[PDB]
Scaffold this active site. Sequence first.
Site, PDB file in Angstrom:
ATOM      1  N   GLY A 156      23.895  21.494  63.122  1.00  0.00           N
ATOM      2  CA  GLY A 156      24.717  22.924  62.826  1.00  0.00           C
ATOM      3  C   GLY A 156      24.602  23.485  64.263  1.00  0.00           C
ATOM      4  O   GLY A 156      24.332  23.044  65.184  1.00  0.00           O
ATOM      5  N   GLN A 157      25.483  24.602  64.254  1.00  0.00           N
ATOM      6  CA  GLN A 157      25.757  25.461  65.492  1.00  0.00           C
ATOM      7  C   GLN A 157      24.410  25.657  66.083  1.00  0.00           C
ATOM      8  O   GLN A 157      24.229  25.594  67.519  1.00  0.00           O
ATOM      9  CB  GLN A 157      26.796  26.584  64.894  1.00  0.00           C
ATOM     10  CG  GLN A 157      27.007  27.421  66.523  1.00  0.00           C
ATOM     11  CD  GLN A 157      27.897  28.374  66.175  1.00  0.00           C
ATOM     12  OE1 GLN A 157      29.138  28.361  65.827  1.00  0.00           O
ATOM     13  NE2 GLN A 157      27.435  29.813  66.308  1.00  0.00           N
ATOM     14  N   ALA A 158      23.570  26.371  65.250  1.00  0.00           N
ATOM     15  CA  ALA A 158      22.154  26.790  65.943  1.00  0.00           C
ATOM     16  C   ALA A 158      21.343  25.789  66.566  1.00  0.00           C
ATOM     17  O   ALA A 158      20.822  26.136  67.512  1.00  0.00           O
ATOM     18  CB  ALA A 158      21.503  27.690  64.638  1.00  0.00           C
ATOM     19  N   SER A 168      19.325  25.972  61.499  1.00  0.00           N
ATOM     20  CA  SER A 168      19.550  27.264  61.007  1.00  0.00           C
ATOM     21  C   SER A 168      19.202  27.148  59.429  1.00  0.00           C
ATOM     22  O   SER A 168      19.932  26.120  58.854  1.00  0.00           O
ATOM     23  CB  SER A 168      20.649  28.081  61.394  1.00  0.00           C
ATOM     24  OG  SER A 168      21.961  27.369  60.927  1.00  0.00           O
ATOM     25  N   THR A 197      26.174  23.370  57.222  1.00  0.00           N
ATOM     26  CA  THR A 197      25.691  22.117  57.909  1.00  0.00           C
ATOM     27  C   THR A 197      24.058  22.351  58.018  1.00  0.00           C
ATOM     28  O   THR A 197      23.288  21.721  57.629  1.00  0.00           O
ATOM     29  CB  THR A 197      26.429  22.127  59.347  1.00  0.00           C
ATOM     30  OG1 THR A 197      27.766  21.919  59.025  1.00  0.00           O
ATOM     31  CG2 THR A 197      25.827  20.827  59.819  1.00  0.00           C
ATOM     32  N   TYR A 243      24.072  34.768  72.089  1.00  0.00           N
ATOM     33  CA  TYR A 243      23.269  33.438  71.590  1.00  0.00           C
ATOM     34  C   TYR A 243      22.609  33.115  72.884  1.00  0.00           C
ATOM     35  O   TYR A 243      21.628  32.190  72.820  1.00  0.00           O
ATOM     36  CB  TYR A 243      24.366  32.533  70.979  1.00  0.00           C
ATOM     37  CG  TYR A 243      24.726  33.012  69.572  1.00  0.00           C
ATOM     38  CD1 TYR A 243      23.792  33.417  68.729  1.00  0.00           C
ATOM     39  CD2 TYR A 243      25.757  32.771  69.104  1.00  0.00           C
ATOM     40  CE1 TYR A 243      23.934  33.718  67.238  1.00  0.00           C
ATOM     41  CE2 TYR A 243      26.223  33.166  67.924  1.00  0.00           C
ATOM     42  CZ  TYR A 243      25.408  33.607  66.817  1.00  0.00           C
ATOM     43  OH  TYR A 243      25.528  33.765  65.544  1.00  0.00           O
ATOM     44  N   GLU A 268      -1.113  15.499  65.475  1.00  0.00           N
ATOM     45  CA  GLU A 268      -2.260  16.577  66.128  1.00  0.00           C
ATOM     46  C   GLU A 268      -1.797  17.808  65.657  1.00  0.00           C
ATOM     47  O   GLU A 268      -2.632  18.744  65.393  1.00  0.00           O
ATOM     48  CB  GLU A 268      -2.672  16.428  67.360  1.00  0.00           C
ATOM     49  CG  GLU A 268      -3.994  16.740  67.657  1.00  0.00           C
ATOM     50  CD  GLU A 268      -4.294  16.796  69.098  1.00  0.00           C
ATOM     51  OE1 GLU A 268      -4.255  15.509  69.894  1.00  0.00           O
ATOM     52  OE2 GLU A 268      -4.848  17.662  69.917  1.00  0.00           O
TER      53      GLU A 268
HETATM   54  N1  LIG Z   1      19.026  32.172  67.290  1.00  0.00           N
HETATM   55  C1  LIG Z   1      20.318  31.455  66.596  1.00  0.00           C
HETATM   56  N2  LIG Z   1      20.995  31.575  65.736  1.00  0.00           N
HETATM   57  C2  LIG Z   1      22.140  31.152  65.385  1.00  0.00           C
HETATM   58  C3  LIG Z   1      22.796  30.548  66.537  1.00  0.00           C
HETATM   59  N3  LIG Z   1      24.380  30.225  66.120  1.00  0.00           N
HETATM   60  C4  LIG Z   1      24.155  30.561  64.631  1.00  0.00           C
HETATM   61  N4  LIG Z   1      22.907  31.159  64.258  1.00  0.00           N
HETATM   62  C5  LIG Z   1      22.492  31.517  62.865  1.00  0.00           C
HETATM   63  O1  LIG Z   1      22.757  30.508  61.981  1.00  0.00           O
HETATM   64  C6  LIG Z   1      23.394  31.212  60.961  1.00  0.00           C
HETATM   65  C7  LIG Z   1      24.421  30.381  60.730  1.00  0.00           C
HETATM   66  O2  LIG Z   1      24.311  29.120  60.728  1.00  0.00           O
HETATM   67  P1  LIG Z   1      25.094  28.184  61.881  1.00  0.00           P
HETATM   68  O3  LIG Z   1      24.362  27.272  62.565  1.00  0.00           O
HETATM   69  O4  LIG Z   1      26.197  28.993  62.673  1.00  0.00           O
HETATM   70  O5  LIG Z   1      26.330  27.433  60.936  1.00  0.00           O
HETATM   71  P2  LIG Z   1      26.262  25.540  60.736  1.00  0.00           P
HETATM   72  O6  LIG Z   1      25.018  25.059  60.602  1.00  0.00           O
HETATM   73  O7  LIG Z   1      27.056  25.095  62.033  1.00  0.00           O
HETATM   74  O8  LIG Z   1      26.994  25.242  59.294  1.00  0.00           O
HETATM   75  P3  LIG Z   1      28.584  25.544  58.797  1.00  0.00           P
HETATM   76  O9  LIG Z   1      29.203  26.362  60.208  1.00  0.00           O
HETATM   77  O10 LIG Z   1      28.571  26.480  57.557  1.00  0.00           O
HETATM   78  O11 LIG Z   1      29.150  24.270  58.613  1.00  0.00           O
HETATM   79  C8  LIG Z   1      23.350  32.518  61.036  1.00  0.00           C
HETATM   80  O12 LIG Z   1      22.059  33.230  60.645  1.00  0.00           O
HETATM   81  C9  LIG Z   1      23.440  32.769  62.519  1.00  0.00           C
HETATM   82  O13 LIG Z   1      22.629  34.163  62.801  1.00  0.00           O
HETATM   83  C10 LIG Z   1      22.377  30.196  68.025  1.00  0.00           C
HETATM   84  O14 LIG Z   1      22.520  29.828  69.082  1.00  0.00           O
HETATM   85  N5  LIG Z   1      20.996  30.973  67.964  1.00  0.00           N
HETATM   86 MG   LIG Z   2      29.362  25.647  61.940  1.00  0.00          MG
END
Ligand SMILES: Nc1nc2c(ncn2[C@@H]2O[C@H](COP(=O)(O)OP(=O)(O)OP(=O)(O)O)[C@@H](O)[C@H]2O)c(=O)[nH]1
Ligand SMILES: [Mg+2]
Lengths: 54, 334, 437, 428
Positions: free
Chosen positions: C10-12, C140, C145, C224, C254
Amino acid sequence: MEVIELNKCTSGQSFEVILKPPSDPSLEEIQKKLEAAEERRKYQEAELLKHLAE
Amino acid sequence: MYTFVVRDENSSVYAEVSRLLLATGQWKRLRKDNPRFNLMLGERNRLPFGRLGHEPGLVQLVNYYRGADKLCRKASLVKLIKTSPELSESCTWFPESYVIYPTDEREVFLAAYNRRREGREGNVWIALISSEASELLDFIDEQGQVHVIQKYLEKPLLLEPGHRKFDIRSWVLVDHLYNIYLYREGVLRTSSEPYNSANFQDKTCHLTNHCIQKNYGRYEEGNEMFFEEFNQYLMDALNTTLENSILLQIKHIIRSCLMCIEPAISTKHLHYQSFQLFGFDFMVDEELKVWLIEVNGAPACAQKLYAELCQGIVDVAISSVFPLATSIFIKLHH
Amino acid sequence: MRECISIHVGQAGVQIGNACWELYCLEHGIQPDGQMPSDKTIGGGDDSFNTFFSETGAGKHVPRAVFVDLEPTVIDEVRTGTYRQLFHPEQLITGKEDAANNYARGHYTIGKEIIDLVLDRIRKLADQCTGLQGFLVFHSFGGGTGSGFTSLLMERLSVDYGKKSKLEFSIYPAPQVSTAVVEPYNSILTTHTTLEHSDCAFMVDNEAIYDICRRNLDIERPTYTNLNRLISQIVSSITASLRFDGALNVDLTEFQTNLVPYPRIHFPLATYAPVISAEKAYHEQLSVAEITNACFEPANQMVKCDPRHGKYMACCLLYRGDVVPKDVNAAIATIKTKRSIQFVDWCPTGFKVGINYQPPTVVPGGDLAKVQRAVCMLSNTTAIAEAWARLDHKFDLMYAKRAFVHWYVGEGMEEGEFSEAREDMAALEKDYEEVGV
Amino acid sequence: MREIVHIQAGQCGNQIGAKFWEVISDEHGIDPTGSYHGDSDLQLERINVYYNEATGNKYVPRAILVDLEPGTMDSVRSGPFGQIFRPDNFVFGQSGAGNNWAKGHYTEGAELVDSVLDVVRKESESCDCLQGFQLTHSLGGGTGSGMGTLLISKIREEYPDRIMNTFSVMPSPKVSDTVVEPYNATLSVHQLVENTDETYCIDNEALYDICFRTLKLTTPTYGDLNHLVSATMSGVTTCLRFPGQLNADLRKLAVNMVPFPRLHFFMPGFAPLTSRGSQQYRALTVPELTQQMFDSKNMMAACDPRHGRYLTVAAIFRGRMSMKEVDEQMLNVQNKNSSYFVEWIPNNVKTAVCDIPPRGLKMSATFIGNSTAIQELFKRISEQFTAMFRRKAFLHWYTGEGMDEMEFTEAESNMNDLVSEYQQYQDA
Ligand SMILES: Nc1nc2c(ncn2[C@@H]2O[C@H](COP(=O)(O)OP(=O)(O)OP(=O)(O)O)[C@@H](O)[C@H]2O)c(=O)[nH]1
Ligand SMILES: [Mg+2]
Ligand SMILES: COc1cc2c(c(OC)c1OC)-c1ccc(OC)c(=O)cc1[C@@H](NC(C)=O)CC2
Ligand SMILES: Nc1nc2c(ncn2[C@@H]2O[C@H](COP(=O)(O)OP(=O)(O)O)[C@@H](O)[C@H]2O)c(=O)[nH]1
Ligand SMILES: [Ca+2]
Ligand SMILES: [Mg+2]
C-alpha cells in the site's frame, strides 16, 4: 538489582536486569474462500444484466 | 461556546453543575454519545477513559480521576495504606483494618485479636458490629461479597446535650493541576439517639448514616450540624476551636491520602485532563483525635450547601480550563 | 547469518519503506547506487548487514525488499527517485487500479488477480537466502490495499513459508492525518484475518507521530516526509539488532521470546526519546537518566495510552549512542521508585537492555537533530488495548446502521464477516482485560 | 484509474458542459485551438484525466456532445472554445425531443443512442485505465432528461464496473420552459436512483435566488445561472485535475460519501459567490470562506440543511492559505453545530487543499454535502407532479409515444420511497 547475561563487543553490549521474580487455514481453504467471493460477484452482475435485459 | 455531556443522571451534584453551566449561556449540552465535547460529566461504572483526548481540535476534561477508585473502595483503601510507605503499616490516623474474602489476611487478623484477647482491652470490630471474632467471620461468608474488618472506635466523642455520636464529612476538589481544594464548609452527620456502650445489637445510635436516622431532627434539622455551631460548642464545652482541635488533622489526612496517589492518577502531561470531587469521612474520639473512615468517589452534598459548592466547582475546576468572556476553598499546599 | 525479507504493501507501507531503506543506507555506509566502500568482501559475505542486503559480483548492495501497490503512482516515485538504482525492477510490483479504501476489494477482487505474481517475486528473493528466518511487513490499517491485500498475503506466507517468523509494522488510522470514514472497518477486518498470522506487530498511531512532530519539531502541518522520517528512526531502532553485531534480538524468533508470552497479545508499545528539532540552535544534550525517564511519558509513545492503568508482560530498552550499563541501572532504580510500573504476577519484573555505541544517524537536511544518546523502549503493556477500544467503538457506531457495508458486500464479501471480525476484537479486548486487572 | 469520459446531453447539458471545458481549459493553460500556453508544470501533471494527447502534442477534451436537435450544438461549435472538441464527437439527430422524456428515452432517442455509444467506445479504448463517466444534463427537457438517462442505462450494461457521475440540473417554476418539467424530472430521478453512483443536484431555483438575492441581478439569464455551475463543477473536480496531498479518484469519493447506495444525491456549494466580469476586490479570510460555504445562501440545491442532517461532507479549499486555519475553522463549524452532523458516522467531514486558485479569485471553497435535507427538493418535484397527474393532465404527449400511466405511478412511487428513505436517517 542483579545484572545477568552480560555480553560485550566493539559495537555495543547487552544485559538483563531482574528487579523482582514472578509469583491455520490451508492453500485449499484460501482458494475456496476467494472463489466463493467471485461467485457472489458473478451472481450479482448476472442479476444486474438480467434486470437490464428486462 | 463550550460543549458538555452528561452521563450520570443520578448524580445530584453534577445535575446542579450542568444546570449552572447552561445558565451562563456559554455552554451547550449534547447527547450522551456525542464525542465532540469539551467537558464530560461521566458515569460511575466503566467510564471510557480510553476514548478521551483523541478528538482533534478539542480540549477534553472529565469529572473523574482514572485510578482514584484505589482510594475510594474499602478493600482498596486498606491495601493502599498498608503497602504504600507514605502511609505505612504504622499509620496513626487510620484504624487497624484487615481484608477478608468469603468462600487474604485471615491469619494476620486473628494474630492481633489474640493480643487483644490476652491483654483484655477493648476488642470490638466493625464489618454489623460484634465483640466476637468467630461470630463476624460466619456473617461475612453469609453475605457473598468481599468486605473489610476494622477496629471499632469504642471511645467516641460525646455531643451535649444528648450524649451522642457523629461523623464529619468534608468535601475536597482536586483540579486539573493537582491543586487540593478543601471546602471550608463541612457537615456533622449526627446520631439523635444516645450512644450505648453495652448493646451493640442496636444500630441506630452506633451508625451515623443519613438513611438509618430517617428521634430524627430533635437537636438540629435533619441530623446535620454545620461548622459554625460545632465550633461554638467546642469553644464552650472543651475550650478549643475546630481549626486547632480537629481541622489540622483533617487537612493532614486529605493531603497525605492524595499526595500518595498523585503519580498514579495525575493527568498533568496526558492527552486528556481530569478533576474530581471527593467525600472524606472522619471520626473524632474523646481525646480529640481524628480517624479516617471512608473516601467517597461520587459524594452527595448537603441541602444547604449545594448552591455554593457547585458554583465553586465551576469556578476552579471548569472555568480554569475553559474561561468565560472571595475563594470558598482552602488550598492545601505541597 | 540468517536473512530477513521486508515487504511493503500500500501507500503507507511503500512510503515508510522509502524512509527506512534511506536510513539503512546512511547507517551502513551504502550509497544511492548501491556501493559500500567499507565492505571488503566483494560479491558476497555473511556479515550482520547481509540480513537486509544481498550482494552482486559488481559490488552492488541490494535490499532484500519487495514493494507492492495496486496502483502505480507511489512506486513510480521509487522507480524514478534518488534510490532508483538500489532496487531491481522485479522487486517493484504495481497494478492498474487501487482498492478504493475498500478492504474487500483489496482482499477478494484485485487480491486474487495479483496474489500469485507477488509470491513468485518473493520466492525469487527467498531462493538467494541460505537460511530464511522470515518477514517484516509494512502496511496501513486504513487503506484498501494496506488492509485487504496484506491480510491475504499474510495468510499465504503462512502456507508457503510455514516455519518462518512474521513481523508487522502497522499504521493505525487517525482523523488528524488524512483518513477515510471507512478506515475503522478496514482496520477491524484486517486485524482479525491477520491476528493468527503475525508473531509480533508494532502499531504506530498517526495521531501520536503527528503530535510529536508538532510539539518537538515545531512543524505546524507535518507532511508524510516528516512523519515517515520519524517512523523510520523508530523502525531502525527495532531492526538495529538484526543489522548490527549484538546479543539481544539477534533473530526474529527472539522478538516473540522477549516481548510476546501470550501469542494473541502480540502488540508491544514503542516509546522513543529524544526527538529534537534540527532548527533548534543551542540544545542541552540529554543524559541516560533523562532519556530513560522519557520512555514512561505518554507524550513520547507511538500510541497514546496510559501504561499506569494496565500491566506489563515484557520490557526492552534499546540504546543508541554514548551509553554504559552503569548509567542504565542507575536510571532504572530511580524510575522504579517514582513511577507506576506494574508487571503481571506470572512474569519477572525486569528489563532486557541492548546498547549500540554508534549514535542515531540523522537524515541530512531532515528535521531531526544529531543527539549523543537515544533510546527506544519496547513494552508489552495491556494499556495498548485502549487503541482497540477506540477503534471498536467507531466500528460499532457505523455498523449499527449498516453504513457503507454494501460497498464491501458488492465486492463478494459476506455481511457475516463484519460481525465475525468484531467478535474476535471483543475476544481480544477481553484477553487484555483478564491479564490487565 | 485516471481517465474520465465526459458526455453532455441536450440544450442545458451542452451549455453548462461547454462552460465547464472553457473554465478548466483556462485552469490547465489550454487555448481555444488546443495548444498549451501555461507557466506551471502542475497544469500538465494530471491533464490525462480530461484530455487526450493529440498529434502535434495538442490536447483534445475527452467529451462527447449529444442532442436530438442540431441547434444548441451548432452554437457550441461556433462558440468561444468550440474548435477544441473532436468533430467526430458531435452526435446529433434532427427532429428534437420537444421537451418530452418519452421522445428522449423511447422513440427519437432510441434511434440515435447507438451512434453515441460508438464514440463512447472509441474514447474508452484510448484510455489507459478508464475511471468512469460524467454526464451534464437537465431533468426537465427531453434530450438530456430522456436520452441522458437512456445513455446511462446503456453505459451501465457495457461498463458495469465503472463509476457513473452526473451533474443534473433540477427544474423550477421560477425558471421554467414548459409545464411538463415535473413529469420529465420524476421519470429521470427513478433512473438516477438506480444507475448513478454520484449525482450533483444543481437546482435552478437555488441558482435563481443566488443571482437575485445575493448577486443582486434583477433579471438573470441562463448565462448567469451557468457561471455558478461551471465554478462549482471546477471546484468539485479540483482533486481529480490537480496534484496535491490527495491520491484519490471518483470510486474513492463514492465509497466514502455514499453510506447507502440509493442516497447518492449531493448538495453542491461555492464561496465566494460572484457575478460575471464585475467581481469583488476584497480578499476573503478563511473564517469567512468556511462561514459562507456552510450557509444555505451558498447552496446550489434549494434546501435548508437545518431541516435535515449531514451524512457526509466534503470540502475543497482552493488557493494559498494557512492549512492550520482551515482545520481550525472546519472543526469549529462541526463542534458548534454537531446536532446537524450524524453521530453514527465518525469524522464524516473531510477537507482537501489545492494550491492553484481559479481565474479571478485569490482563494475559494467548494462544498459537497450528502444531507437528508435533499428530500425537500424531491418532495417539491413530487407535489408539482401530483398536481397535474391527479387529473391526468398533459399526459397525452407521453401516451402518444407509447407510454402507459403505470410507468408514471411507478416513478412517483420510487421517488416517494427515496424521500421516506431520507426521512429514515433524519431522526435515529
Ligand atoms: N504514517 C503514514 N501514514 C500514511 C502514509 N500514507 C498513507 N497513510 C495512512 O494510511 C491510511 C490510508 O492508507 P493508504 O496506504 O493511503 O491506502 P492503500 O494501502 O494504498 O490502499 P488503497 O489506496 O485504498 O488501494 C490513512 O489512514 C493514512 O493516514 C504515510 O506515508 N505515512
Ligand atoms: Mg493507495
Ligand atoms: C477526488 O475527489 C475527492 C475524493 C475523495 C474525497 C474528497 O473530499 C475531500 C474528494 O474531493 C471532492 C474524500 C471524500 C470524503 C470523505 O469524507 C466523508 C472521506 O472520508 C475521504 C475523502 C478522500 N480521502 C481523504 C483523506 O480526504 C478519498 C476520496
Ligand atoms: N441552469 C440551466 N438550466 C437550463 C439551461 N438551459 C435549459 N435549462 C433548463 O432545462 C430545462 C429544459 O431542458 P432542455 O435542456 O432545454 O431540454 P433538452 O434540450 O431536450 O435537453 C428547463 O428546466 C430549463 O430551465 C441552462 O443553460 N442553464
Ligand atoms: Ca560482504
Ligand atoms: Mg429548452
